């Protein structure tokens, strides 16, 4: 039978993942907070991953797959706690794999280089350190850590809005890395479809094909929205890093939005009604 899936964390990524997995025939349940309204038709329960006493029901779901999105939502208190509590509460479930949504922010090194999963991350802030601490736990589990770059998509249109106001553009012209919400969800669904037969890797960077300096993205977005700014050189390109998605491409997954031109092209078209 198709694997039963528990998605812990029902933000936009978890909801889009649930939609795809349900369409493919899986039994999917989410774990959300009470202040998080759900769209009609999604199956969830309310619990608090930081409070073990609210997690006593989840083992009855008997998931074969856990997708844990909470630490990623938290990234955007300790993160490892919530994951530890959730795994402990699943003692007794027929759990075969854990997919953990992490962040490329764990790569705190700033380099004018391409980094990949072989590059050791040097965390430079509390969020990165907490994320690597949450990751570390999974060493004993059959698992895949997914370090997502910056998610964009419906309801994550900050770059589109910022592009409308060139006086508010950042002084530093750093590299930016992104993944569209629907590719992040579809890649996890793809790995779930593959898990039984093409065993997933323990770690992927989940990012699209084209990092770019933030000013190039802002100008491209400004150009397509009729936003005026002065012609001329952008600030020197410096800061952050470039992230390679070579391993994601080698899995056979096909990006829906290979680069910002495709993804932001679609979002501009949709927001216009």
UniProtKB/TrEMBL annotation:
PANTHER family: NAD(P)-BINDING DOMAIN-CONTAINING PROTEIN-RELATED (PTHR48079:SF6), PROTEIN YEEZ (PTHR48079)
Protein's name according to its UniProt entry: NAD-dependent epimerase/dehydratase
Domain of life: Bacteria
Coiled-coil portions: none
One Pfam entry name: Epimerase
Domain named NAD-dependent epimerase/dehydratase: residues: 5-200
GO cellular component: cytoplasm
InterPro entries: Epimerase_deHydtase, NAD(P)-bd_dom_sf, NAD(P)-dependent_oxidoreduct
N-terminal signal peptide: none
């Amino acid at each position: 039978s198709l694997s039963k899936i528990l998605i812990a964390g029902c933000g936009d990524l978890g909801l889009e993942l649930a939609r795809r997995l349900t369409a493919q025939g899986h039994e999917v349940t989410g774990l959300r907070r009470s202040a998080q309204p759900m769209p009609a038709g999604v199956q969830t329960l309310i619990a608090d991953v930081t409070r073990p006493d609210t997690l006593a029901s989840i083992v009855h779901l008997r998931p074969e797959i856990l997708v844990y999105c909470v630490a990623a939502s938290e990234y955007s208190l300790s993160y490892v706690e919530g994951l530890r509590n959730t795994l402990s509460a699943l003692e007794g479930a027929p759990l075969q794999h854990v997919f953990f949504v992490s962040s490329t922010g764990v790569y705190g090194q700033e380099v004018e280089e391409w980094l990949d999963e072989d590059t050791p991350p040097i965390a430079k802030d509390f969020s990165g350190k907490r994320m690597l601490e949450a990751e570390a736990l999974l060493a004993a589990y059959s698992s895949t850590i997914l370090r997502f770059s910056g998610i964009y998509g419906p309801g994550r249109l900050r770059m589109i809005r910022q592009a409308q106001t060139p006086e508010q553009w950042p002084a530093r012209n750093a590299w930016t890395n992104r993944i569209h919400r629907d590719d992040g969800a579809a890649f996890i669904a793809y790995l779930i479809q593959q898990r039984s037969h093409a065993v997933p890797e323990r770690l992927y960077i989940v990012t699209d094909n084209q990092p770019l300096p933030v000013h190039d993205l802002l100008r491209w977005l400004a150009d397509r929205q009729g936003i005026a700014y002065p012609a001329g050189a952008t600030p020197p390109v410096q800061g952050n890093k470039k992230l390679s998605n070579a391993r994601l491409l080698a899995s056979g997954y096909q990006l829906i939005y290979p680069d910002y031109v495709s993804g932001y092209g679609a979002l501009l078209a949709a927001m216009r009604e």
